Amino acid sequence: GVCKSYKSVALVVGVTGIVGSSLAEVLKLPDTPGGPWKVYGVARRPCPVWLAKKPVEYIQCDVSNNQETISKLSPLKDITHIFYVSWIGSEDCQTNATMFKNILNSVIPNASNLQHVCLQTGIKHYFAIFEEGSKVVPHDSPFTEDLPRLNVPNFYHDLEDILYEETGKNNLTWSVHRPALVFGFSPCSMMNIVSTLCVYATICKHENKALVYPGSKNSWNCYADAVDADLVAEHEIWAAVDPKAKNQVLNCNNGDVFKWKHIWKKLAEEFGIEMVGYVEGKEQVSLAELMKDKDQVWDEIVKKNNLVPTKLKEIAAFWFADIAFCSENLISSMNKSKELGFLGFRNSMKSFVSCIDKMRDYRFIP
Amino acid sequence: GVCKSYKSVALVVGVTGIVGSSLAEVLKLPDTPGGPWKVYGVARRPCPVWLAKKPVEYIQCDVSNNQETISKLSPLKDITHIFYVSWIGSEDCQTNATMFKNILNSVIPNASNLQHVCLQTGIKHYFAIFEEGSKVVPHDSPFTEDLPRLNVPNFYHDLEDILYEETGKNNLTWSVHRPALVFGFSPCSMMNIVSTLCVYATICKHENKALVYPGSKNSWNCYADAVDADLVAEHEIWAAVDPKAKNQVLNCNNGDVFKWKHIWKKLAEEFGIEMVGYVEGKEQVSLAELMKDKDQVWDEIVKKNNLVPTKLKEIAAFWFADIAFCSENLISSMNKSKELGFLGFRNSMKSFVSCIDKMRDYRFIP
Numbered sequence: 001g002v003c004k005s006y007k008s009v010a011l012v013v014g015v016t017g018i019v020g021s022s023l024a025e026v027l028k029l030p031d032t033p034g035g036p037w038k039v040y041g042v043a044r045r046p047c048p049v050w051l052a053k054k055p056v057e058y059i060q061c062d063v064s065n066n067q068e069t070i071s072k073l074s075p076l077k078d079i080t081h082i083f084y085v086s087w088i089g090s091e092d093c094q095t096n097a098t099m100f101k102n103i104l105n106s107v108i109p110n111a112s113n114l115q116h117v118c119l120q121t122g123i124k125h126y127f128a129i130f131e132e133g134s135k136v137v138p139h140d141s142p143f144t145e146d147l148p149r150l151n152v153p154n155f156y157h158d159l160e161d162i163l164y165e166e167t168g169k170n171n172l173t174w175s176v177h178r179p180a181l182v183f184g185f186s187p188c189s190m191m192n193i194v195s196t197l198c199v200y201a202t203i204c205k206h207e208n209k210a211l212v213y214p215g216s217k218n219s220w221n222c223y224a225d226a227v228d229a230d231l232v233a234e235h236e237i238w239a240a241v242d243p244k245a246k247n248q249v250l251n252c253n254n255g256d257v258f259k260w261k262h263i264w265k266k267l268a269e270e271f272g273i274e275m276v277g278y279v280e281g282k283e284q285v286s287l288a289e290l291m292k293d294k295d296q297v298w299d300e301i302v303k304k305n306n307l308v309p310t311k312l313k314e315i316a317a318f319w320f321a322d323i324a325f326c327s328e329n330l331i332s333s334m335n336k337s338k339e340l341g342f343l344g345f346r347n348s349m350k351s352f353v354s355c356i357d358k359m360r361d362y363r364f365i366p
Numbered sequence: 367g368v369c370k371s372y373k374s375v376a377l378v379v380g381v382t383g384i385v386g387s388s389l390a391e392v393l394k395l396p397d398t399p400g401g402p403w404k405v406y407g408v409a410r411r412p413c414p415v416w417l418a419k420k421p422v423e424y425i426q427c428d429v430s431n432n433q434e435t436i437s438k439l440s441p442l443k444d445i446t447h448i449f450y451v452s453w454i455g456s457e458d459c460q461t462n463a464t465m466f467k468n469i470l471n472s473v474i475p476n477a478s479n480l481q482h483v484c485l486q487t488g489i490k491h492y493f494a495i496f497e498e499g500s501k502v503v504p505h506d507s508p509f510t511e512d513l514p515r516l517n518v519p520n521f522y523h524d525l526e527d528i529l530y531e532e533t534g535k536n537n538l539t540w541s542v543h544r545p546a547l548v549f550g551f552s553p554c555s556m557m558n559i560v561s562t563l564c565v566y567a568t569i570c571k572h573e574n575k576a577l578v579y580p581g582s583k584n585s586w587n588c589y590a591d592a593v594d595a596d597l598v599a600e601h602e603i604w605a606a607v608d609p610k611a612k613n614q615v616l617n618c619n620n621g622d623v624f625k626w627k628h629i630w631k632k633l634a635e636e637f638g639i640e641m642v643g644y645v646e647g648k649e650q651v652s653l654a655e656l657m658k659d660k661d662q663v664w665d666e667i668v669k670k671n672n673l674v675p676t677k678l679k680e681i682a683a684f685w686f687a688d689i690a691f692c693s694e695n696l697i698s699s700m701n702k703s704k705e706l707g708f709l710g711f712r713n714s715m716k717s718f719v720s721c722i723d724k725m726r727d728y729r730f731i732p
């Protein structure tokens with residue numbers, strides 16, 4: 001037979017991640033802009049069982065290794081769009097920069113029809129965290145894309161600088177996407193809040209305990225925002241395909257706000273367990289500390305419920321919930337995207353529930 | 367010659383108001399849904415000079431007077447859509463209800479092609495104000511259209527009940543619109559925040575004084591929301607014309623959030639004067655009290671700048687700014703509208719400036 005024809009060919013760098021895994025789905029929908037799409041998906045681990053049944057060409061590659069990345073990605077002559085949706089899992093500016101440089105250096109010389117590079121960073125562009133994750137200290141929200149860089153180390157700055165330099169030299173278009181806190185479904189993310197809170201709720205249910213809110217008063221009551229992973233995928237695809245969006249820094253959030261107190265009530269309802277909300281006068285406690293000895297409990301839950309096998313430290317990021325629960329004043333603006341014609345949105349309460357439903361559907365959570 | 371043909375015929379009840387005046391413009395645009403539109407505009411005062419040059423058929427009528435309203439509106443056999451964008455200027459449930467009943471009782475029996483009634487109320491549906499406007503005490507924001515009525519007097523409840531009863535009996539569709547704080551341009555509104563703050567800035571400039579923020583700490587720093595009058599008009603027209611939107615209660619806001627501290631800086635810049643922002647430890651002061659003896663100063667400003675003649679108490683509502691500046695936690699949701707397909711929005715910072723620009727253009731403000 002004949003080789004399949006595609007309109008566009010994606011390289012999704014971080015296909016097992018919270019946004020990469022959504023791109024693996026969204027790119028294959030029949031009405032997705034730029035379709036039909038071929039999808040190459042890169043990650044360091046062997047292809048997990050939960051991605052092996054998707055029509056994605058999986059490439060196992062440690063992208064921090066230059067020779068390996070050249071060997072694995074230089075043959076992919078047909079790539080038209082790169083979606084860089086990865087990070088190394090630390091704040092190290094040099095090691096994160098290596099990963100992204102290796103992707104560009106391996107693909108740019110080999111993919112003659114390459115058009116566009118999408119770089120995913122985040123709203124942490126706009127604020128700093130000090131004192132071991134305990135002092136989140138933002139200025140000037142609602143955050144807009146005209147705000148200047150803070151005079152601090154931030155690997156996002158290094159990634160942007162590489163993006164601008166390499167795309168400019170090679171007559172490629174670029175986009176920088178700055179998602180809000182992501183609501184998604186991947187059980188292999190280093191920062192998946194919905195999975196983290198579903199794991200906590202599951203452990204509470206298993207132990208006949210209430211869903212006890214561990215966070216600060218401020219984070220219980222403040223306005224917060226987030227972004228569905230599928231909306232980030234849609235936004236990245238929009239910028240990849242629509243000429244109006246080219247060569248732009250763009251925030252990405254669901255378009256609305258929510259409060260954690262309301263999310264908490266829904267989470268308890270979803271798991272059929274009692275809620276203990278914020279108690280006046282109580283200081284935040286560490287969810288990471290509450291959960292530090294639960295690896296074996298999680299293993300038993302997996303077995304008892306016949307879940308996809310996951311390790312507690314991989315499916316959940318309790319440390320990340322602890323940061324969320326001492327954060328306030330982090331709202332970002334979607335005006336720039338809307339004014340450029342991107343009117344995608346989600347109802348955040350519905351998005352949170354959609355992610356629970358999906359993780360249950362996929363047997364990541366009971 | 368021949369009588370003009372129209373697709374739709376609007377009765378705008380409150381045409382001099384902050385939303386009515388915008389409907390008078392939006393309804394006459396060539397691409398407005400349901401067009402071409404004929405517009406009847408009702409208000410109690412004689413047609414002001416600033417509305418006499420618009421292609422609106424002005425009807426001077428005290429709609430609180432049943433015999434007068436019958437006499438003036440019963441001949442209008444061609445009305446297809448009613449836009450009720452008025453209130454009496456007090457919280458009296460009976461007198462507000464009279465105005466709306468009189469409109470329906472005069473038009474329903476006479477306008478055989480009547481289709482739809484749009485009722486404008488507001489986000490005050492969701493919360494109560496106590497102690498002489500000084501204790502704004504909301505629960506459950508972001509406010510959604512599934513929230514039940516509060517067990518208090520609110521003329522909005524009476525207006526809704528009339529709307530449901532009269533439309534149900536007569537096979538008419540209905541919509542209830544609940545705008546956020548409105549950003550608009552009418553100098554005859556009883557509650558126009560932009561005009562109020564422009565008047566204050568103008569008086570400060572005239573007196574060689576700084577633009578001193580008089581409000582609370584909380585309102586300086588909190589997230590707030592608003593709605594451009596033109597967006598309320600668009601939203602009301604959408605619900606009037608699109609079958610998907612019929613028989614719905616619908617919030618209306620710009621789709622984003624802002625902070626008054628940022629608005630304040632822009633206002634000072636716009637008037638070329640020094641800003642004094644919130645000062646830590648200062649309690650809110652009454653802007654109404656600061657302005658109580660300024661009627662003659664405003665008269666002199668009007669003369670010196672050759673403005674459209676306005677009385678201070680009509681162009682500005684300092685009492686209303688005082689309420690805004692002790693308000694927090696009043697954000698409303700636009701998810702329901704968006705999920706029904708209304709994707710209209712404004713950048714609120716740009717909307718605030720657009721309203722300043724328009725009031726200057728129209729010579730209401732220097």
Ligand SMILES: NC(=O)c1ccc[n+]([C@@H]2O[C@H](COP(=O)([O-])OP(=O)(O)OC[C@H]3O[C@@H](n4cnc5c(N)ncnc54)[C@H](OP(=O)(O)O)[C@@H]3O)[C@@H](O)[C@H]2O)c1
Binds near residue numbers: 014087181183192
């Ligand atoms: N998650 C959120 O809530 C959120 C919110 C705002 C912004 N962001 C930003 O989004 C960006 C992307 O992060 P994410 O949260 O989407 O990632 P994530 O869900 O943690 O996924 C990270 C991905 O990178 C891959 N990866 C890591 N090291 C690799 C290596 N050496 N070689 C190949 N693949 C490698 C991982 O695969 P393996 O596991 O096999 O290594 C995985 O596919 C970051 O800048 C992050 O700060 C995230």
Ligand SMILES: NC(=O)c1ccc[n+]([C@@H]2O[C@H](COP(=O)([O-])OP(=O)(O)OC[C@H]3O[C@@H](n4cnc5c(N)ncnc54)[C@H](OP(=O)(O)O)[C@@H]3O)[C@@H](O)[C@H]2O)c1
Binds near residue numbers: 408411412
């Ligand atoms: N303004 C805002 O920021 C805001 C925000 C949210 C919700 N809302 C709500 O919107 C609704 C409409 O108010 P608005 O603010 O749009 O009004 P507005 O700008 O104060 O205008 C009121 C209009 O009603 C007319 N009117 C009053 N009494 C009348 C009478 N007896 N006969 C005929 N016309 C009469 C006025 O004309 P004359 O002056 O000639 O009487 C004027 O055209 C209210 O329920 C209000 O609470 C307003």
